[PDB]
Amino acid sequence: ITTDNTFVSGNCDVVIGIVNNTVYDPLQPELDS
Amino acid sequence: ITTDNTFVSGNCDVVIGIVNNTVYDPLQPELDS
Numbered sequence: 001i002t003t004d005n006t007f008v009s010g011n012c013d014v015v016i017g018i019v020n021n022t023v024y025d026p027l028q029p030e031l032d033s
Numbered sequence: 034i035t036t037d038n039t040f041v042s043g044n045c046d047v048v049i050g051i052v053n054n055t056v057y058d059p060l061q062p063e064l065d066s
């Protein structure tokens with residue numbers, strides 16, 4: 001799950017069926033490296 | 034106004050009716066931090 005394929009919206013307390021995970025921004029390896 | 038919803042083309046000098054404001058790149062806070 002990458003933020004050039006997903007987008008940020010809303011909060012996790014309303015939608016039903018949402019699950020715990022981590023979403024890997026492709027900007028993160030660029031900024032960490 | 035996000036660069037994930039707008040794109041990079043042109044300048045202030047061609048298109049009629051442009052108003053002066055700021056554009057919040059969603060990359061900009063990670064660039065700053």
Ligand SMILES: *[C@@H]1O[C@H](CO)[C@@H](O)[C@H](O)[C@H]1NC(C)=O
Binds near residue numbers: 016017
């Ligand atoms: C319907 O979805 C909820 C939330 O995802 C889940 O807890 C529930 O078990 C589901 N219903 C069935 C019959 O599995």
Ligand SMILES: *[C@@H]1O[C@H](CO)[C@@H](O)[C@H](O)[C@H]1NC(C)=O
Binds near residue numbers: 020
């Ligand atoms: C994981 O999802 C649950 C909902 O099942 C939520 O309450 C929790 O805040 C989430 N995050 C965690 C455990 O870091």
